[PDB]
Design a protein around this ligand. Structure first.
Ligand SMILES: Nc1ncnc2c1ncn2[C@@H]1O[C@H](COP(=O)(O)OP(=O)(O)NP(=O)(O)O)[C@@H](O)[C@H]1O
Lengths: 49, 107, 49, 49, 218, 67, 204, 49
């Protein structure tokens, strides 16, 4: 029972399908950072409270 | 096989239509009646332009990958050399083919 | 396969599913008891069933 | 329609047995009603009675 | 005592004694009949002949003809009759008739080029049992069916494809009829390449792998 | 230019030709009653340019019979 | 009979029994190999040829369009031989020749005291993704080169083949002495020369 | 089309009730024109939104 869907190991490591993991990951990371930055920017002007 | 069948059928169109017209009415047919109905309309003796166009439409475009020049290592796969190291027997075949077609210019 | 021998059970009758007109007739009698707006195009409401 | 033109003869038997019990046709001993969940075959039976 | 299932001749003789009282048209070949019913046991032929008899008495005749015997056989192998195909539109009857006629036509054509296929017997588009249309062939002797040569399998494949390709060449448009052909065909085609080894895969037809069936006991 | 044939035709040819054209058009288009153009041009891929002999409609037409 | 590493025939029939629906050819059981287990490599190659000979001869006589379904199990047996050569470290691949089988061997008890059944597991941890292609390509080379070889063998000896089939058709069962006699009086000279060279040796 | 509705039973979708003809493709036929038409109709909503 070996793996038979080799597709690329020349400049990366890919298997058949996967196309959809780079888009997903960049979206997730970008949105989480934007949210954290908005939280920081609000709390940064209300330190006395 | 599918090209063979489509070639058989796009000659006896009249026989098929006579058979359909006959069968749709009685809803049943016996082998003898069918055989004589199909014998009544033989195929055309010559090929007219309409018959030639129909026979050219009786072709398929089913792609066959390892056909002709694609019978050797890449087998017509564009990405095979970015995924697999070249096997050993493939290198041997390349070597013997190269020596064959490279001593024949001297032979 | 014992009862299907002659004399015991030698006749089978197939009762099929209704059609447009059959369904229209069926629902025209389920209205003889209940209250129903009379001018109902029974044929069309039966075509969609 | 088909089984109408058929069950005319079983009704013929149910009306008068010695009319066709000797007239060549066999003894009508048993019949099966086949249809589908929801065919309500009882209905048909009543009509024959 | 061990009584086995009857062979061709056993069924033939049961038929002979079962119609000994009756009268049959001289055209039907009951050797050919008993040759096309492998798997029945004794009483089924009685049911068939009685059913044919009652269709005879409903036909206002007494002589049993090919049509009545075929009706009996069909009722006791396929099932009860069912209402006919609609006629308000061209499509249904046209498509099913095209299926039947294409199969019959290419069968009769292949039979007249190599001689391996059988002969067609009876075409019908009377919805009867579970199917809407039917095409029966004349079975040969058991000696015919012990082997499977290459040409015979090629012809079986072509016959599998004929129905859908006929509907498409008559109607002018693809349907889902092809769906039921290719499936069957593909199965056979695999058996043609891997298990039996008839193709040219490798220079000879011997591949490194093949899938042998398992018994139906499992 | 356009159709030429004869010069300016007489008065009897006009009438007999009108009735003849009506008859041939009717008997030609008879079997294609009640379907769309794509179905037709896929049933007659070679063109509707002669009479049909196998019509199987609910009220079937025979060869060369008009409506 | 013409391969110097295979045992001599003992009898050949064409009368099917109640369990084998075709003929049989039976060889003299060599006790040495059967008792020690010394099945050499030469012998395995020749056994491959023998396993394909049936289909080779069918195609030679009855034409290619008449290949039958009588050689399904002989094809399975030829596959068995060809994979055993690869999995027993007899290959000609340099990374495989005298070094490895195919995978990991695990034995299991059969339905007897001394019977063991072998199993081989092959994963990504022992086959490197481009040795799979070589295993396939070499087993395929073995099978199809063997077929071509035996086909040419039977081509060179057509006379003996037809004589043998006529005699078999007329007697329904023959013994080894008749076979060897016929083939020695009708065989090709070079094949008989080879068969005579290796005539005395016990084990090969 | 027999009826077009918006959020029936409060579900957050639409709903269109299609009535068809059973005497044209008798529960078994599927041409190519029909399939392409269905694809277009099912993508229409996304495109309009
Ligand atoms: N021709 C008809 N006219 C009026 N009502 C009908 C007709 N046919 C069926 N029905 C209705 O069908 C309903 C279901 O009948 P039912 O007795 O359940 O038949 P059934 O097929 O035996 N049920 P099942 O045992 O599950 O198959 C009845 O209550 C009837 O009102």
């Amino acid at each position: 029972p070996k793996r038979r869907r080799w597709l690329l190991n020349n400049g990366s490591w890919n298997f058949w399908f996967n196309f959809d993991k780079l888009y997903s990951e960049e979206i997730v990371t970008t949105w989480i950072l934007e949210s954290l930055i908005q939280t920081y920017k609000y709390l940064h002007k209300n330190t006395e409270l | 096989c599918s090209e063979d069948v489509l070639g058989i059928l796009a000659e006896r169109q009249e026989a098929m239509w006579a058979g359909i017209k006959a069968l749709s009415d009685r809803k049943e047919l016996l082998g003898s009646e069918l055989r004589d109905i199909f014998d009544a309309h033989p195929a055309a003796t010559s090929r007219d332009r309409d018959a030639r166009a129909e026979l050219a439409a009786a072709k398929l475009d089913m792609t066959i990958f390892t056909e002709g020049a694609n019978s050797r290592w890449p087998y017509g796969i564009e990405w095979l050399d970015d995924a697999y190291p070249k096997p050993y027997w493939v290198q041997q075949q390349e070597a013997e083919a190269a020596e064959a077609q490279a001593k024949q210019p001297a032979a | 396969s014992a009862l299907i021998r002659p004399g015991r059970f030698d006749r089978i009758i197939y009762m099929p599913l209704p059609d447009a007109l059959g369904r229209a007739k069926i629902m025209q009698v389920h209205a003889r008891n209940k209250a129903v707006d009379p001018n109902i195009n029974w044929y069309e409401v039966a075509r969609a069933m | 329609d088909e089984v109408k033109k058929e069950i005319n003869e079983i009704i013929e038997y149910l009306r008068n047995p010695a009319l066709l019990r000797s007239r060549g046709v066999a003894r009508i001993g048993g019949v099966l009603l086949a249809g589908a969940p929801g065919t309500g075959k009882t209905l048909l039976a009543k009509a024959i009675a | 005592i061990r009584m086995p299932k009857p062979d061709t001749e056993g069924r033939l003789e049961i038929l002979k004694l079962h119609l000994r009282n009756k009268q049959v048209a001289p055209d039907v070949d009951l050797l050919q009949l008993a040759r096309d019913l492998p798997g029945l046991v004794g009483a089924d032929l009685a049911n068939i002949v009685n059913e044919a008899a009652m269709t005879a008495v409903r036909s206002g005749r007494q002589q049993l003809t090919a049509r009545d015997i075929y009706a009996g056989v069909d009722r006791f192998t396929q099932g009860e009759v069912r209402p006919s195909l609609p006629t308000a539109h061209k499509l249904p009857v046209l498509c099913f008739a095209a299926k039947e006629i294409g199969i019959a036509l290419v069968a009769g054509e292949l039979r007249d080029r190599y001689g391996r296929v059988e002969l067609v017997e009876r075409v019908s588009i009377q919805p009867k049992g579970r199917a809407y249309s039917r095409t029966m062939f004349q079975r040969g002797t058991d000696e015919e069916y012990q082997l499977m040569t290459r040409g015979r399998l090629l012809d079986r494949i072509r016959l599998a494809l004929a129905g859908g390709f006929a509907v498409r060449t008559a109607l002018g448009e693809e349907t889902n009829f092809t769906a039921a052909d290719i499936k069957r065909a593909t199965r056979m085609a695999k058996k043609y390449v891997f298990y039996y080894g008839f193709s040219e895969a490798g220079g000879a037809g011997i591949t490194t792998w093949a899938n042998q069936p398992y018994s139906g006991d499992f | 230019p356009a159709w030429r044939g004869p010069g300016e035709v007489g008065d009897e040819d006009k009438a007999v030709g009108c009735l003849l054209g009506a008859a041939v058009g009717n008997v030609l288009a008879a079997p294609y009653q009640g379907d769309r153009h794509f179905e037709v041009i896929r049933l007659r891929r070679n063109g509707v340019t002669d009479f049909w002999k196998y019509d199987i409609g609910a009220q079937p037409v025979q060869y060369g019979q008009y409506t | 009979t013409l391969l110097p590493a295979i045992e001599p025939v003992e009898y050949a029939t064409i009368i099917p029994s109640t369990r084998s629906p075709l003929g049989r050819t039976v060889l003299k059981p060599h006790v040495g190999r059967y008792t020690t287990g010394v099945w050499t490599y030469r012998y395995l190659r020749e056994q491959l040829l023998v396993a394909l000979a049936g289909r080779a001869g069918e195609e030679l006589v009855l034409g290619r369009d008449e290949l039958s379904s009588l050689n399904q199990h002989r094809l399975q047996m030829a596959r068995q031989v060809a994979w055993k050569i690869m999995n027993s470290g007899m290959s000609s691949h340099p990374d495989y020749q005298h070094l490895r089988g195919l995978g990991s061997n695990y034995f299991d008890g059969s339905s007897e005291p001394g019977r063991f059944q072998q199993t081989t597991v092959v994963m990504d941890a022992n086959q490197t993704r481009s040795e799979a292609v070589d295993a396939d390509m070499e087993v395929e080379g073995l099978l199809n080169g063997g077929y071509k070889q035996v086909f040419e063998l039977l081509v060179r000896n057509r006379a003996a083949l037809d004589a043998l089939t006529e005699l078999l058709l007329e007697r329904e069962k023959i013994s080894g002495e008749e076979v060897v006699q016929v083939v020695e009086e009708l065989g090709h000279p070079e094949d008989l020369a080879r068969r005579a060279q290796w005539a005395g040796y016990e084990l090969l | 089309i027999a009826r077009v509705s918006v959020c029936p039973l409060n579900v957050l979708t639409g709903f269109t009730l299609f009535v068809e003809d059973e005497d044209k493709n008798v529960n078994a036929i599927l041409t190519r024109s029909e399939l392409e038409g269905r694809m277009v109709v099912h993508l229409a909503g996304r495109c309009a939104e």
